[PDB]
Design a protein around this ligand. Structure first.
Ligand SMILES: *SC[C@H](N)C(=O)N[C@H]1[C@@H](O[C@@H](CC(=O)O)C(=O)O)O[C@H](CO)[C@@H](O)[C@@H]1O
Ligand SMILES: *SC[C@H](N)C(=O)N[C@H]1[C@@H](O[C@@H](CC(=O)O)C(=O)O)O[C@H](CO)[C@@H](O)[C@@H]1O
Lengths: 138, 138
């Protein structure tokens, strides 16, 4: 589980995502974003099939789309509990994992819960992310 | 699908795996391995939950175990059909994807079919790979 979680985290950090692993790191990051920037958050997970769908879609769209988020960050639900709880204070939605959140400044503009990922074709998940970035990112 | 497949391939090539994407590349690689070396093959896939389980387990064990394969390579079933068919000529097993193969020289010593991956905890998949490398790799 140790090496597995680091690989699942590495899938994101090897492709531009900043890993926020303490409550303090989340507060320091989210309370310092510029009001006009967009921040894409992947809430990672180790278990089930949904987690394996969420990582590739997020990496592919957030790094290749024309309209891309200013910032890409991740918290790891289950593994980094305090970081995940603090991020969820900014999101203010029903908690689930994996899940996606998109911010403009500190305001949530898009949220995808676990139930919209589970059992969904990876190409369709990527398409929703493309739509959300196109509507909200410069 | 284009960007998605490259991310799923990149998960392996960003962590030491050689991507073999033509029939010629597979023949040239497998027909040139040393008789005493071990070659771990990940047959990648874009679809279903099994594919998302197979990648992290393979990366974590093949790069972190004490006993590690000499060579790590991958063919992408569906995406690179000719490469996958040629690799399957060396494997000589029922075809499935995702699947794992381990060679000593050109002789198959371990095989894991899709049906042993689908619905399996990722930690248990990693454990079988650890056992197979421990038994067969220096
Ligand atoms: S996948 C099996 C897993 N133990 C689980 O039940 N996950 C659910 C759980 O996730 C939490 C982290 C964890 O892996 O335990 C979390 O998100 O904090 O709870 C959420 C919310 O109910 C579910 O979406 C997960 O499936
Ligand atoms: S996951 C849905 C997919 N279309 C599929 O049916 N995969 C099966 C298929 O895989 C081939 C590549 C592909 O994605 O089409 C392949 O491995 O060459 O066939 C194999 C063998 O029967 C199955 O193990 C896959 O689930």
């Amino acid at each position: 589980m140790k090496e597995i979680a680091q690989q699942m985290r590495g899938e994101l950090t090897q492709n531009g995502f900043t890993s926020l692993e303490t409550s303090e790191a989340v507060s320091e990051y989210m309370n310092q974003v510029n009001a006009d920037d967009t921040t894409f958050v992947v809430i990672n997970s180790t278990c089930g099939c949904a987690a394996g769908l969420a990582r590739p879609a997020a990496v592919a769209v957030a790094t290749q789309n024309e309209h891309r988020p200013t910032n890409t960050v991740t918290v790891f639900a289950g593994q980094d509990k305090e970081a995940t709880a603090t991020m969820r204070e900014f999101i203010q939605q029903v908690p689930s994992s994996p899940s996606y959140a998109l911010f403009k400044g500190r305001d949530l503009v898009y949220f995808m819960p676990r139930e919209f990922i589970e059992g969904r074709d990876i190409n369709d998940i990527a398409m929703d992310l493309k739509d959300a970035f196109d509507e909200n990112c410069k």
